[PDB]
Amino acid sequence: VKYTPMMLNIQNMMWWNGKRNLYRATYREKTWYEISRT
């Protein structure tokens, strides 16, 4: 793998096109917005 789909800004979302990115967590206990609430 030399170029990951996250480079090309490809929108892969389940509710959008039924696809999800290969390198991600299946479950996320806290989303990015909760982590940023310092």
Place this chain on the structure above:
RNA sequence: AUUUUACCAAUUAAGAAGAAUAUUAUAAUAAUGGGUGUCUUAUAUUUUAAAUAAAUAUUUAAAUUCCGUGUAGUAAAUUUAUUA
């Protein structure tokens, strides 16, 4: 002795279950992919990886900048909760 010229005018009540567990938003309590006219045994029915996502964010300041694509806990399991 039979014998009426040619042309020229218009849509109005509808009758009868021949109208509904009807359409569209609305339920913060369910959820292993629904397939009935189905039905033997699976070497043959395996999808996972720290990122923005079926999880979606109460402001007008300053500042990176050949000329601002922007605002932070409100309560620490606290009642904004994806419901049928």
